[PDB]
Amino acid sequence: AKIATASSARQTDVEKPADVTFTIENV
Amino acid sequence: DDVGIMQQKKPPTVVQSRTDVFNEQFANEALHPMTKVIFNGLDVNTEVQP
8 A cells, every 4th residue: 555565374284183073874 | 478567576686895995705695696785875877857
């Protein structure tokens, strides 16, 4: 708009511990 | 490759040696790319042509 600037970013990392499910899959 | 509209960035320029006896020492100096002008307060061209 007035002064040309510079910014920075860093790709983020997201992970949780493997959760528990009660539903079965195959026969 | 194009002419910028928003104002840029500067070092910025500084005045230094003028008189007929200096005796400079060259202490400091920074090492970063800068600019040094001889004459104090120049930049004279106030005419604008619409």
